[PDB]
Amino acid sequence: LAPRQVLDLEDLVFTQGSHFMANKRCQLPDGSFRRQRKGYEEVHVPALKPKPFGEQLLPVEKLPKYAQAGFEGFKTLNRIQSKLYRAALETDENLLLCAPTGAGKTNVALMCMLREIGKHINMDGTINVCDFKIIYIAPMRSLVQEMVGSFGKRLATYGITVAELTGDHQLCKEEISATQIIVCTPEKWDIITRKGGERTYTQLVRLIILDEIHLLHDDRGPVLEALVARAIRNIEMTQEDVRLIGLSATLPNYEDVATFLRVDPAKGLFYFDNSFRPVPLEQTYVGITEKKAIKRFQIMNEIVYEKIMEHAGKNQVLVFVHSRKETGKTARAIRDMCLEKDTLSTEVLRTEAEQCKNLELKDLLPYGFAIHHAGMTRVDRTLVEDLFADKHIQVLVSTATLAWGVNLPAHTVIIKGTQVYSPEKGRWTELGALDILQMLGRAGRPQYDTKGEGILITSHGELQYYLSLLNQQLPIESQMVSKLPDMLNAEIVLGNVQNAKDAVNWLGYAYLYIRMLRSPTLYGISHDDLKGDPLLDQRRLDLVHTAALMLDKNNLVKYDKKTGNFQVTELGRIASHYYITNDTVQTYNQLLKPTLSEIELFRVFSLSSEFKNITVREEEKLELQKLLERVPIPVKESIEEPSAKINVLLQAFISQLKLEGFALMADMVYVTQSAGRLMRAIFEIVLNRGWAQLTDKTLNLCKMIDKRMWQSMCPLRQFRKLPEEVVKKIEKKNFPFERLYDLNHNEIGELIRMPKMGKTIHKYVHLFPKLELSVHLQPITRSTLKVELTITPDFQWDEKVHGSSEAFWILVEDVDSEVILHHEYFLLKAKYAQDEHLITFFVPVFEPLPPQYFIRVVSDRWLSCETQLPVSFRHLILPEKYPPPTELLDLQPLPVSALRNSAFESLYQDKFPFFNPIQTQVFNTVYNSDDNVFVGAPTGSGKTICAEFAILRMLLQSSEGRCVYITPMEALAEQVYMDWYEKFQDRLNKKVVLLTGETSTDLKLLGKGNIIISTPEKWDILSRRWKQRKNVQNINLFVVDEVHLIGGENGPVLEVICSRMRYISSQIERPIRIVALSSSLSNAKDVAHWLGCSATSTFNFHPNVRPVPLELHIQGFNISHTQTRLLSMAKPVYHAITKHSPKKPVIVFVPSRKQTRLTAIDILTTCAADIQRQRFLHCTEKDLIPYLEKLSDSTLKETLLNGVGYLHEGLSPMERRLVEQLFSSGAIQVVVASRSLCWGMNVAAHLVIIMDTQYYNGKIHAYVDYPIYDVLQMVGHANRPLQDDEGRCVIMCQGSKKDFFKKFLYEPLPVESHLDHCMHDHFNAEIVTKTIENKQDAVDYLTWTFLYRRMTQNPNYYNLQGISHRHLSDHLSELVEQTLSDLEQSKCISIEDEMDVAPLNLGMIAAYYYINYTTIELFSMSLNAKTKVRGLIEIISNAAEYENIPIRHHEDCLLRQLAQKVPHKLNNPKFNDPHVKTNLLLQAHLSRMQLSAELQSDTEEILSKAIRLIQACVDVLSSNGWLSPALAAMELAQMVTQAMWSKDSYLKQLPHFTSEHIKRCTDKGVESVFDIMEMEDEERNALLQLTDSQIADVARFCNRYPNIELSYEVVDKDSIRSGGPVVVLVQLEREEEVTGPVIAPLFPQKREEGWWVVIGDAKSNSLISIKRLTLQQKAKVKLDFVAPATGAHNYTLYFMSDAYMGCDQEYKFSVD
Amino acid sequence: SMTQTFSSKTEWRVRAISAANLHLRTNHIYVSSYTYILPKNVLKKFICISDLRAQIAGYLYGVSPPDNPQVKEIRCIVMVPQWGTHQTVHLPGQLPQHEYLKEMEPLGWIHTQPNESPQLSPQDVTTHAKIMADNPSWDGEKTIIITCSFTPGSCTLTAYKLTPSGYEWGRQNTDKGNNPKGYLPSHYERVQMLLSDRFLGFFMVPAQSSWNYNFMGVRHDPNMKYELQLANPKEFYHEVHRPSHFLNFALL
Secondary structure, three states, X not given: OOOOOOOOOOOOOOOOHHHOOOOOOOOOOOOOEEOOOOOEEEEEEOOOOOOOOOOOOEEHHHOOHHHOOOOXXXXXXXXXXXXXXXXHHOOOOOEEEEOOOOOOHHHHHHHHHHXXXXXXXXXXXXXOOOOOEEEEEOOOHHHHHHHHHHHHHHHHHHOOOEEEOOOOOOOOOHHHOOOOEEEEOHHHHHHHHOOOOOOOOHHHEEEEEEOOHHHHHOOOHHHHHXXXXXXXXXXXXXXXXXXXXXXXXXXXXXXXXXXXXXXXXXXXXXXXXXXXXXXOEEEEEEEEOOOOOOHHXXXXXXXXXXXXXXXXXXXXXXEEOOOXXXXXXXXXXXXHHOOOOOOOOOHHHHHHHHHOOOOOOOOOOOOOEEEEOOOOOOOOOHHHHHHHHOOOOOEEEEOHHHHHHOOOOEOEEXXXXXXXXXXOOOEEEEOOHHHHHHHHOOEOOXXXXXXXXXXXXXXXXXXXXXXXXXXXXXXXXXXXOOOHHHHHHHHHHOOOOOEHHHHHHHHOOOHHHHHHHHOOOOOOOOHHHHOOXXXXXXXXXXXXXXXXXXXHHOOOEOOOOOOOEXXXXXXXHHHHHOOOOHHHHHHHHHHOOOOOOHHHHHHHHOOOHHHOOOOOOHHHHHHHHHHHHOOOOOOOOOOOOHHHHXXXXXXXXXXXXXXXXXXXXXXXXXXXXXXXXXXXXXXXXXXXXXXXXXXXXXXXXXXXXXXOOOOOOOHHHHOOOOOOOOOHHHHHOOOOHHHOOOOOOOOHHHHOOOHHHHHHHHHHHOOOOOEEEEEEEEXXXXXXXXXXXXXXXXXXXXXXXXXXXXXXXXXXXOOOOOEEEEEEEEEEEHHHOOOOEEEEEEEEOOOOOOOEXXXXXXXXXXXXXXXXXXXXXXXXXXXXXXXXXXXXXXXOOOEHHHHOOHXXXXXXOOOOOEOOHHHHHHHHHHHOOOOOEEEEOOOOOOHHHHHHHHHHHHHHHHOOOOEEEEOOOHHHHHHHHHHHHHHHHHOOOOOEEEOOOOHHHHHHHHHHOOEEEEOHHHHHHHHOOOOOOHHHHOOOEEEEOOHHHHHOOOHHHHHHHHHHHHHHHHHHOOOOEEEEEEOOEOOHHHHHHHOOOOHHHEEEOOHHHOOOOXXXXXXXXXXXXXXXXXXXXXXXHHHHHHHHOOOOOEEEEEOOHHHHHHHHHHHHHHHHHOOXXXXXXXXOOOOOOOOOOOOOOOOHHHHHHOOEEEEOOOOOHHHHHHHHHHHHHOOEOEEEEEHHHHHOOOOOEOEEEEEXXXXXXXXXXXXXXOOHHHHHHHHOOEOOOOOOOOEEEEEEEEHHHHHHHHHHHHOOEOOOOOHHHOOHHHHHHHHXXXXXXXXXXXXXXXXXXXXXXXXXXOHHHHOOOOOOHHHHHHHXXXXXXXXXXXXXXXXXXXXXXOOEEEEOHHHHHHHHOOOOHHHHHHHHHHOOOOOOHHHHHHHHHOOHHHOOOOOOOOOOOOOOXXXXXXXXXXXXXXXXXXXXXXXXXXXXXXOOOOOOOHHHHHHHHHHHHHHHHHHHHHHHHHHOOOHHHXXXXXXXXXXXXXXXXXOOOHHHHOOOOXXXXXXXXXXXXXXXXHHHHOOOOHHHHOOOOOOHHHHHHHHHHHHHOOOEEEEEEEOOOOOOOOOXXXXXXXXXXXXXXXXXXXXXXXXXOOOOOEEEEEEEEOOOOEEEEEEEEEOEOEOEEEEOOEOOOOOOOEEEEEEEEOOOOOOOEOOEEEOO | OOOOOOOOOOHHHHHHHHHOOHHHHHHOEEEOOOEEEEEHHHHHHHHHOOOOOOOOEEEEEEEOOOOOOOEEEEEEEEOOOEEEOOOOEEOOOOOOOOHHHHXXXXXXXEEEEOOOOOOOOHHHHHHHHHHHXXXXXXXXXXXXXXXXXXXXXXXXXXXXXXXXXXXXXXXXXXXXXXXXXXXXXXXXXXXXXXXXXXXXXXXXXEOOOOOEOOOOHHHOOOOOOOOEEEOOOOOOOOHHHOHHHHHOOOOO
């Protein structure tokens, strides 16, 4: 520990970058010799010779054959590829290959690529696109594009895609889902992996090729070190390997490079000296000694001419100049003095010499000259590349782009200068090492040259350098000490480095570290303290310390030198993510303020440290003052300030001025390449700070920089596909652009007065992005306003202008348009480019009430593309302030003896002696009265005991009364059922039952059950049938728990059933008692009034009265990138534990399954850093090993051994039990639970920490806020009435959510109804059941609801403007009218005389099976007389009930090859629709395929609805008379039950009966359950090699297997009555007493056999009679139909189960 | 031996650099010791959107508190197409018209001026009286003239009423100079004015363009018609107010 020294990093820096020369002498090959001339010296180095070939070349025929396509059309690996193929293709070992340029490294890289491509070959289709990604890192952008097409062409036979990475943000993530090999530059890959929080696609990286890895020696080198250290260290902390491949030049320290790549030097290091160059190179270096300005200049042209003369006619000469300006000039200067005499064929040149024209070019061709630079047209130097390739061009003067981006070789290469102007340095400097090697690397064409000739002309002072570079002697050093602060911040922002210990470990992976060990003298270190610090531990700590301090001073990081801990900041994250050096971010931090002019914004940009080397040269103040004099944004600073120069160049670039100074245009390019991401940094800073005015200015400046125009230019200029010139037409007609939308086509042609293009302007006027906004104000309270914003697009999409999406910013600004009260990012996709979009958010409001807010939606990319909606509150009806709570009276706590029933007292007195104050206040009313009671109290108030009181009262009155207990969540229900099973069943001999899906089952549970526990949907399905069912109306007590959830997403079902129980009690006139429990409600009186609770019997307690006092703390967190925000919460979680509960149990809720594991480990690492390791384990490592013998999660046991547990949906059921056990016992002090488990946790804690309050939604690809109900429920876990004097809770949220949480946690909760959005399926049910028979019945029905009450108390919320009595019958009528017409249009009801409604057949099926009315509608269209078992699944998958099956891009792939294995290949697959995932999951289920555990839990919910949908279909096919498809769906019910296809064998239903068993029985003559049920008894145990316990399982199935012999008879068969009744009697008698339900181990819920009896004409495909039938013992069923005319027809009977396969009976009978 | 060269120093560049510091005067606003209550939020915005040499003006609209009809709460400022000098501000003859202002009564106008003065300007009386003579909605006993003068590092506000005799003089006055004939200090009284934080005011701005025409005075004439919209005004030197400065690089 302990940094002991603060370094000066700048002193340690190698100033010359890649021009640094570590070697002080350079030895040359033997033939080298030096000359001397007038003004220049010449060094000649002779061409090497290959060395005596000491193994043989490899025929491609011997490569592994999965790999032979990459080498299609190839003979034989060359020398290098042949030495590398075994290391490349037969092993996974990391490689470092040093070879001369073009020796064949690229094919060696394909070989590694091909090995990884192999890792995902089955014989399947062939390659699995999904399992991997390959990253090719190339230095130059020109290199990337060549490699993309070159690799793509060679691998397209493998069906893989290679793509460059465009500089974009969110459109370039789309292309990563599609490509397998990504080719990018080091800095591009650095930017992407600096964010990583996307739920990355970079976890698929299996292979990283680092081409030209000697870039380490460049100023860009540290990017390479940042990449490798991040990858190798990520290998440590995930244990999945990534292969690394380095390709470098042959230079010193390559072995240190190999150490840095973790290359085994005895396995993966390959060094091929320059004698392996493809064509031998004769080198010539020319060192000019003349230091005179431009006599050196013409000495250069003198040397160029003499050298070019040596090659006239004999060889083409590629002359390299270092500016797109110098290509033409030098090329013509050569041709100029070659007019003295020339030396040549010519009219194949002259033909194309002005077929193609282009200024200069056979002014620059006569004697086959040419230029090549990035400014020329694509084809205007496409086969100008290839006039050279045909040996037709004699001289080509080019830049370095041709060397990097085009495979164009030449016998002679002349590098004219070695000096280039560098704006980043603001100075002329030498070329980079890569450029020199790349250019000279192009000397000597592949076949035709026996030697290339490279001529380098430079200043004589640089000879040793270029001599060293080209002869294996320029060492590769590390340049990273400069960039260490920036790089280290990136690792902190990622959470990879959380303290200086981490950073020192991280630093040890740098190339810098290797070099510091091998060569400490070079790196400022030191032989005699190295040996006193042999790992350089102190040194690294000191460097990291210096960097940390710098980052702390600039406010990127919070670093305290004691702990050595790092703390991420938002500024810190912005610096890393926008690739901005940290000095710049501090300047922004101090200068950026909300009061900022555009004058001062332009000044702030110009002060960015990226420009720290720019100066105002004297030969620059020409234009710089001419432009500054009248430039549109004034510049306060003088001309002598370089800040003013950068300012002028930015504005000149936007106005598209073109300047005359050579350096100034070069400086302008550097300034504005940087501006894009620099200005976006400022945008993100000010937007996230809320500064409305500055945000608008900066986002404008982004778009101006991007589109090179000011706002005051007509926005039609942005239509890239625009060669018109006819907006300067429009711009001189100064008139509002928004006015052209109004008008047609011809009047535009008249305003701008060009008639011929009135229509085209009109076309582009409406291609311009334009949105319309409407708003629905929804008051929540008098201080919080909910807003529903509807965005309606008002333009035409066109992928030629818009692509696949258009991004917008939604901005809610206050009265003065200076504070952004809320903002969010809105993305309009082309698939929904014609739909309305709904957005909801919360904003604060105060009660003097501001005049208005404003809603802006502006284009993220388009200039002048914004819509602002004033949101005025002059007519906003606020709800009334909530009434005071019910006063908690200081009654002495009521003892359990006041029950006056020793049996009843046996349920409590063991645990506690007195009920709490809340229970004591309500007791009398609940116990000694039958009044309807409302109890509203904070969760954890013992509200459920109060309902137990009412049940106890019922049991005394009735002795056999029914009580229905409703709770909103299935996890709460199952917990209530156990506690209440012990009490009322075990200790009171009543019946406690918990309903399931099956109505057949639940119906009997309602008869026998003394108390029935139920979720809402399960009671809705049954209470709908209340007029048919006495059990439903004969309910003494109806308890609805957690009733405040009527305002949540699933509220309406709960609201419908309660109102139904209120309505039923009116009809039956023998009242049902209703008790409602609730979290503290602000509008408690409305709930009580709706449920008939007298005000004296409504207990409205507010948060302050919770029996165990609650200490709630809400910590705000500023970071808006949720991944970084979570990181900044990691340590504060641990600190909260020590502050608020260092000894008592802690529950930490985290947003996702993955996060439980991470935070548990995080808490432990911080615990061990406290060196309080295992402070959370209160039992010895001994008591835990009886518990720790279930490691199905390998990591939970390391966690438990250190005192921490975690809980998520992925752990086994009893895994969750043991963590809960060890937790509630006290042995484990901390448990980290996922947010989804917050409703079914059987443990409680002293302290609850809520780590963030958002979760990612896989479907909608967006972060969702925790519902307020879930937060209340999480907080209620900080309550231990037996052990704690207090409960504590810390909520860590994004700061923008803080005020909301204080409002709705401290104060009681306001709840509204959302039944007005859920009307159809319930109206359908009440029209079926005849409760609603006309449009007036529908109105009366609405007034029983909770929705009604709230309409008068908060009209605006439900879209009312007055609570007048006619206002809301008008409103109620409209709701009735639109719900009935939808139901009528979808053919579930009929409407007579604009008034009378009645149920249709579909409506009956929908209400009966609890099926959404639109699901049954698509059923009615798709179902048809012919579709069979295949198309049935196809139409059931499309049900609305399966619309919300989750979709993750993870299994966007397992299903891609699951459709490969399903029997029924599917119509037109799209693969991210839930309806096709459900299709494949259903097929995967009948084939007994085992999937993920995630796809397993997905399927268990799919199957939970299937039987209802299958049965809805059978009910539809039959009433239409279709015999074949009906029976087909009837066997689908048994199919989905036992998981089978009908082609499968009936014996696949028996336990332990596997693959080979059926072949053993088809071989003998048994193929039925009955064929087994008796072959001679032990003649079967010798036929099934099975355990005696396994045999016992096969017997139980056979005894539950249906054994009914059916009797059919027909009444009075002597009567052909030509069209009358034909009763037919069927009797069913089984031999057994079916003790138990259906035995189907692969179906999630317990079923009971359901039977159909069908009458049909086999030949006719004609069902005649149909009736369902539940059967055991007795069963007689009657079927009837109408006779035909003729006396000769036979029908066939059908006995059909919905559970078992192979029991289907079939008799034939002609009844005349 | 001379050879010196003039390089233009356009003065709107210097004044535009000053306008960016206007926000600092909004921390040092002083009021001079019927009744009119100006809300601070629109006043501060009105200061920032202004200029140190060119006057700008805004119409005042409000309503008396429920039971207190002797005080006028200023609830809205309307910016209309205008240009100004250091002595007046040229408004269009047409007074604002909008549904939102119909529930309110007009209370006069507020304008800025360079230097403080113990007296309401003569061309200010002429302006106010000439408006009253064309619009009987301006009571005279209820419409005021709030001056906002740029004292050093500060902003001092004074609210004046017109007298009956000041009205009859201002209508007939044609001398636009700063000492016309028949001008007398008995043409105006001071009225009680208070700056408050209790309620917020709001702005209305032109619908088809902005309010600032000082860089394009030719396309502005007294007969110009304009609609309004609920929105806040843009600063004086904002881009949209001087598009020539931007578009005139298509020549450079």
